Amino acid sequence: AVSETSKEVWQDVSDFSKKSWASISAWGEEAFNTAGVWTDKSIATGKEWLKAADKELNEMLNPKTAKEARIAINTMADTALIRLFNEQPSAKLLFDKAYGYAVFDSRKFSLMLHTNQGAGVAVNRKTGKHTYMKMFGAGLAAGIGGKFYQQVILFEDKARFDAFVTQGWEATSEVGVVAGKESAELTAKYNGGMAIYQIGEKGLLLDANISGSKYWIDKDLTE
Template sequence: MKKMYTLSKFLLISHLLLFSTISFCQAGLWDSVKSVASDVGDAVTDTASKVGDTASDMIEDDVSPAQKRQTIDNNAQKTLSRLFEESREAQEYYDKAKGYAVFDSHEFAFLIKTGTGSGVAVNKIDNSRTYMKMLGAGANIGGGIKYMQIIFIFPTEVALDAFINDGWSADADASAVGGDDSGQLGLTLADGTKVYELVDTGIMAKMSIGGTKYWKDDDLN
């Protein structure tokens, strides 16, 4: 009964989000869709958070925190192995890095896209682990659901600690939103952190992670 209620709540929120977006289009405001992600601010973020939490509730009702941590760790290791197979450059950055973070994200793409995910940030010096959440919102034309992995490789402990303890928002980092024109794969942030995005077809050559936020998962730490 609880899962049926949770599923109904999730579907209702999803429909409200979609119908609200369509109403913008019908009102002749389609040209403003590209700015909806930033203009909608807390409203979209809050709705996306509720959708993500509801989806997590449906999937994880019977999963213990220890099992969740183990699943996240296993996914992170598999993702790193795949990344290194795809890019020798990424392997070289990782070998010199002080830490890394790996996130699995499900992106629900309608007219407004919302992406929710979980991951782990690891200090390579002492192997300490911090489990984290992610949320993204932005304008999108099209539909569907996409699965992806986001990998951060931190050159210094300072960069890693700031990411973990302060959280991180791509909107506050122009280098993340603007992209990397260096010709290399992924992004290079202002502090030297490398960011890669893996999808079904491999590493995204050009990417922008604007609209995404990362923070500690209090339930798993």
């Protein structure tokens, strides 16, 4: 009756959304942790999942607590990988060989973020460890990616990943950037295993210099 439906109104208006997202939130990880080619079916399902994920990310913007931020960034990172594979299926084959990866987004999923910065995370695929990080994007400052920007870095080799997550990084050239000129497999081979993708809403950003960018550990978020 009304007593019960009333309680339903508070409960479902407050929580039904989170429960609905929780029923599908695993899809991205489940999909990308299964080795193999990123097929047309995976692309189509991924696009459908991204519709829901981006609605959820809208609700996650501007987190108030470190826990909320870590959750938001983690969710963002899953979306970037799916978006990347949908835009460039070959990247899935490189991801399958990755020791680790990092993802940054210009949206405010960290506690603090300034214009031209990105919030993100580096994930060690062997140990599971997440290192929360921030970036200054030279391309953002130059005027690209204004409506939407993600950056995905794949690390085939442990040494460069370990350096990235312990020391941070500064980009002093375009070495490592996937820029429409060659296989990312080759980019990585000649860059200590490291390949950098820049992602727009509709496709890869292929002419966006990163030189001048900086990457550091977000001390307000990582434990």
